[PDB]
Ligand binder design. Structure first.
Ligand SMILES: OC[C@H]1O[C@H](O[C@H]2[C@H](O)[C@@H](O)[C@@H](O[C@H]3[C@H](O)[C@@H](O)[C@@H](O)O[C@@H]3CO)O[C@@H]2CO)[C@H](O)[C@@H](O)[C@@H]1O
Ligand SMILES: OC[C@H]1O[C@H](O[C@H]2[C@H](O)[C@@H](O)[C@@H](O[C@H]3[C@H](O)[C@@H](O)[C@@H](O)O[C@@H]3CO)O[C@@H]2CO)[C@H](O)[C@@H](O)[C@@H]1O
Ligand code: CL
Ligand code: CL
Ligand code: CL
Ligand code: CL
Ligand code: CL
Ligand code: CL
Ligand code: CL
Ligand code: CL
Ligand code: CL
Ligand code: CL
Lengths: 474, 474
């Protein structure tokens, strides 16, 4: 489980975790509470998996977009700041940690990608994506290349995709229509197409990932890269003289980065909820705290109004905010992970040539708009079905297809719930399994239990719904 | 298979099949072609099952509503009458055998249910359903009952259900919205409710079926029944003095029978298509022909204008047409069978008390609006998927998760088709099986075949679609 007394903190390996450990120590010098800071791999995946059972860190750091999922799963303890404190952080940033009218994490900083150029290799950076092929040609001559960024992650290639019309889920009347996915429209295609063409023409390489691009840029091998504030430190170390400017335009429109807001959320299974709140509110979210971290690795435009008033002077932050405004805040809904995985795949297959732009995006659209089982299960309230089945058993203890020689002398609300598993039978099964589990202990007899299994088994048919071929009800 | 030279005809056991055999003989006396007339059980089920392989009758008789399904399955040969002939039959009736802008059967007669009363027991039949409980009470005293009709079939109980708002599929802009099902609205509930209440109060019995009601009425045991023209003969035999009148009203509206049009369709696998056409056009659809049949058992309002001009004089036919007009023509779409099965179930469970009106209807709505696998398969054009997979194999004969040490140095349109099986995985499987079958013969090698199976197997995943847990590709 989770030790009471200490604070364990998870944050991604590309963030200023050393800078955060310092705030960990200042907090310890004043508190005596041991603050541990870790940067595991795939922590945004691991957390859902571990916080579920009741383990993991007290605090979890990631971009706001994943927290909706965590919330829906009941993994995040709600956070509640006295009005005053809230007045210190930008409205904009508070919204990003708001799910179902609740605050589920603490905002830290606003992130957005910008175009980063080597002032040596390229005094004047291009205004347009279209300009780039010419450049690379020119640069290849001098033994260099025009541009290199991470292609393995959608986050990076999305600003171009989004430029001429691409979007994730439309925002219709105060909500996201997760059936209205715009990754397969003219714009998205145009964008991804241009991207692939760059590859087809030897201007960049489908296999290029983060570290490869970072190294290339930091060793002065390519004129341009695309990245976020976090990456500024390593360059500051690298002897390269760099500028940070607005991303190029495509078909005349600005690239539109998915703006994300670094957030800190408290494990809803942690004993140290108070300590956590005090840490984040009184130490991290302070001018010294943020600075300590921002020193290790730049946060972008911090959530706290006072320190940002300082940071704003930095031209790099200006360009960061410029790109951010051209962009859109990522949604934080549960379906976002689906969307991301979907697009990650499309981009890769298209980039690698396994598929065509039109095909890959078409698959992404289909898949990103498909509801996942785990989500549906969490949202399910299966009690009505439980109650129904129990009752039905009493009325069959003395009254077609009878169970025993003795049988041979709520339903709506339940079915309403099961309706949600009508398009995924494996899922329908899981829902039945969940029902079983939630009752096995309340089942006295055994005639009782198996006369429950069989009833449970043809429950979907009773609702006029589709049913699994097989379904183990251990 | 089907013998060339003879004509085999299927018609339901409750129709004037003897009367039709006569036209069978007059046709034989003039032709020498042996005409066989049979009335098998569940012939509307058997036919789809047998006509599929290429057997069955040359001609198939049923209400128009089932023929849409037969058509979609390619079981019905299109029928084409010279304008003149068509001018002999009512427009209304031609529409009923029209599917996808094609004539798929020959209209014979218009059917509709009416209220049939014993003039001895009840000189003045009720205007309203509401009046009936009082009657039955009064009649039970005299040792009789007010009303008895078939409860095992939805066809009979639907006029009441439909009365105050019930419908099958809404007709939206020239088409039926099979997702807009009106069997679970206030009206339908009201209607079914009244019906169940009749039962709950000992006014009728949930177990009452056709023969039980017919016998009861024909032996003068109940004052009223609800039935169609076909039933007139047996009563004519029965010494009971009966009238045929408009069905009672419910909540102030007329009962609304599903008007059906007896149709004759030609097996699209029969060699005798010409004979069939000549039989139906030149013998059956004539004043003598129809009469011969109408003699055995009344057809209702026949499709042929001339004979109906005669029949119209019969007050019984008048009442039949009155009820028909208060009613609605059944749709002939493939989904109709689903709808009927769904409602048959609801009615029975509600009537039997296994479920409540609200629950049962709610299940019917859900289920009647659910697309069936066989339908989706028929409508599927899986070629694109076939072509795609074949090609993909060539491009893998020398180029992640490789098949052989050698591999280790259309898609959209296809997926568009597979999208249709996204809510039924068993079905997705069948679609893959169909693809396999349609290629096993075109597959030279064996490395070829199994390198096809594996590709085929993760085809849904390539389309971002859901996939079966298991799928045998024999
Ligand atoms: O590619 C598959 C992948 O998608 C998911 O990651 C996304 C995040 O949810 C999202 O916040 C963003 O990640 C970036 C941050 O905003 C930023 O601080 C910095 O770390 O760069 C990040 C990108 O590498 O975008 C990504 C998608 O690219 C998802 O959460 C994962 O589970 C998954 O493996
Ligand atoms: O109840 C289950 C059942 O539904 C289907 O039968 C329907 C028919 O499609 C339909 O034409 C109608 O059947 C009647 C005729 O119109 C009439 O000529 C006479 O025969 O009375 C009939 C009713 O018994 O209504 C029924 C539904 O009640 C379906 O086709 C069957 O497969 C099925 O078993
Ligand atoms: Cl690790
Ligand atoms: Cl909480
Ligand atoms: Cl307060
Ligand atoms: Cl969006
Ligand atoms: Cl478009
Ligand atoms: Cl038989
Ligand atoms: Cl044909
Ligand atoms: Cl003609
Ligand atoms: Cl209708
Ligand atoms: Cl309603």
């Amino acid at each position: 489980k989770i030790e009471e007394g200490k604070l364990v903190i998870w944050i991604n390996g590309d963030k200023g975790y050393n800078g955060l450990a310092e705030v960990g120590k200042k907090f310890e010098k004043d508190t005596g509470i041991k603050v541990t800071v870790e940067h595991p791999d795939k922590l945004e995946e691991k957390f859902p998996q571990v916080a579920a059972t009741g383990d993991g860190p007290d605090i979890i750091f990631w971009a706001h977009d994943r927290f909706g999922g965590y919330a829906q799963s009941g993994l995040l303890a709600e956070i509640t700041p006295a009005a005053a404190f809230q007045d210190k952080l930008y409205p904009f940033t508070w919204d990003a940690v708001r799910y179902n009218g609740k605050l589920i994490a603490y905002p830290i900083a606003v992130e957005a990608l910008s175009l980063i150029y080597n002032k040596d290799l390229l005094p004047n950076p291009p205004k347009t994506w279209e300009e780039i092929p010419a450049l690379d040609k020119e640069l290849k001559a001098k033994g260099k290349s025009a541009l290199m960024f991470n292609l393995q992650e959608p986050y990076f290639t999305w600003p171009l995709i989004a430029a001429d019309g691409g979007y994730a889920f439309k925002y219709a009347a105060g909500k996201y229509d997760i059936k209205d996915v715009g990754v397969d429209n003219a714009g998205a295609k145009a964008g991804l197409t241009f991207l692939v063409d760059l590859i087809k023409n030897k201007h960049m390489n489908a296999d290029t990932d983060y570290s490869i691009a970072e190294a290339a840029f930091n060793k002065g091998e390519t004129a341009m890269t695309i990245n976020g504030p976090w990456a500024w430190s390593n360059i500051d170390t690298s002897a390269v003289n760099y500028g940070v400017t607005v991303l190029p335009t495509f078909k005349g429109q600005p690239s539109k980065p998915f703006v994300g807001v670094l957030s800190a959320g408290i494990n809803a299974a942690s004993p140290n909820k108070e300590l956590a709140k005090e840490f984040l509110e009184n130490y991290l979210l302070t001018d010294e705290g943020l600075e300590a971290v921002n020193k290790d690795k730049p946060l972008g435009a911090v959530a706290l109004k006072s320190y940002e008033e300082e940071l704003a002077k930095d031209p790099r932050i200006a360009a960061t905010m410029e790109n951010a405004q051209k962009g859109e805040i990522m949604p934080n809904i549960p379906q976002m992970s689906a969307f991301w995985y979907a697009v990650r795949t499309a981009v890769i297959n298209a980039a690698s040539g396994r598929q065509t732009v039109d095909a890959a995006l078409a698959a992404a659209q289909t898949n990103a708009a498909a509801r996942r089982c785990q989500s549906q299960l969490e949202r399910a309230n299966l009690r009505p079905c439980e109650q129904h089945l129990m009752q039905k058993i009493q009325r069959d203890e003395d009254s077609r297809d009878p169970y025993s020689p003795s049988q041979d002398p709520h339903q709506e609300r339940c079915c309403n719930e099961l309706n949600e598993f009508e398009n995924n039978q494996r899922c329908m099964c899981e829902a039945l399994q969940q029902i079983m589990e939630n009752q096995s202990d309340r089942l006295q007899g055994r005639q009782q239990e198996q006369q429950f299994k069989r009833e449970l088994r043809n429950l979907p048919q009773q609702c006029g719904l589709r049913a699994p071929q097989r379904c183990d009800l251990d």
